[PDB]
């Protein structure tokens, strides 16, 4: 799933995804985070 959190750095989406679902696996594109459950 993704989050509206306006991400600005690919490496920033890692700590975010981990804080979103629990794992730091995802990227940042289209102004959104792409975390994979």
Q: What is the CATH number of the domain that holds 19?
A: 3.30.30.10
The residue behind tokens 């989050």 is 3
10, two tokens: 């690919």
Q: What is the domain range of residue 9? A: 2-35
What approach was used to elucidate this structure? NMR
CB 32 within 8 A of CB 3: yes
State the sign of the Cα–Cα–Cα–Cα dihedral 12, 2, 29, 36. positive
The residue behind tokens 């594109």 is 29
The residue behind tokens 């920033």 is 12
Instruction: Give the alpha-carbon dihedral of 30, 22, 19, 13, to 10 degrees.
Output: -30
Q: How many domains does the chain have?
A: 1
CA distance 13 to 11: 5
Instruction: Give the alpha-carbon dihedral of 30, 14, 16, 33, to 10 degrees.
Output: 10
Query: Helices (DSSP H) in 1-37: which residue ranges?
Result: 10-20
């Amino acid at each position: 799933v993704f989050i509206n959190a306006k991400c600005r750095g690919s490496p920033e989406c890692l700590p975010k995804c981990k804080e979103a679902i629990g794992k730091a696996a995802g990227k940042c594109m289209n102004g959104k985070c792409k975390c994979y459950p």
